[PDB]
Amino acid sequence: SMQEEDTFRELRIFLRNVTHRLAIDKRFRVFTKPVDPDEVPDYVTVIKQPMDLSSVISKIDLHKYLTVKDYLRDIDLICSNALEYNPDRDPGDRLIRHRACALRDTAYAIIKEELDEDFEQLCEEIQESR
Numbered sequence: 001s002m003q004e005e006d007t008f009r010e011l012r013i014f015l016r017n018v019t020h021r022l023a024i025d026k027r028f029r030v031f032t033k034p035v036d037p038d039e040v041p042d043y044v045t046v047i048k049q050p051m052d053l054s055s056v057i058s059k060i061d062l063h064k065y066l067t068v069k070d071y072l073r074d075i076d077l078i079c080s081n082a083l084e085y086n087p088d089r090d091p092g093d094r095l096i097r098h099r100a101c102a103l104r105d106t107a108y109a110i111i112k113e114e115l116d117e118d119f120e121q122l123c124e125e126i127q128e129s130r
């Protein structure tokens with residue numbers, strides 16, 4: 001319906017705003033675009049489903065997220081991929097793991113403060129009716 005399309009449009013606006021705020025944070029530059037395969041040639045082999053913030057924006061625009069829960073699954077994926085691909089105690093690995101956890105924590109904190117629970121519940125109920 002018109003009510004439901006308006007709901008999902010608002011969801012997309014909200015998700016773009018959150019994602020933009022993550023993307024402009026200097027700490028999260030490494031997560032803004034897909035990896036350069038010349039920098040990490042084995043990434044395609046090691047990481048089952050790559051994810052990055054530009055891909056998240058594309059998915060928002062393709063109407064791939066019908067709830068904030070679905071969106072957070074991809075944010076979680078960005079983080080979990082980083083913990084998986086960079087496991088070692090070397091400072092480089094520790095830096096990116098810290099940034100990955102910070103990205104995840106920042107997204108969840110923004111959502112905690114700014115997402116109305118009744119809006120999310122409406123999204124979830126529309127999604128489950130399809």
Ligand SMILES: CO[C@H]1CNC[C@@H](OCC2CCC(F)(F)CC2)[C@@H]1Nc1ncc(-c2cncc(C)c2)c2cc(C)c(=O)[nH]c12
Nearest residue numbers: 030034035036037039040081082085086090092093095096
């Ligand atoms: C197995 O590879 C890792 C070996 N240890 C050092 C790691 O690099 C640490 C950098 C990563 C980039 C930074 F900004 F976060 C600062 C710490 C290695 N891991 C990775 N190395 C390089 C990249 C990368 C990919 N494309 C473009 C650029 C400029 C850099 C990445 C990217 C991702 C997403 C990742 O998880 N690990 C990387």
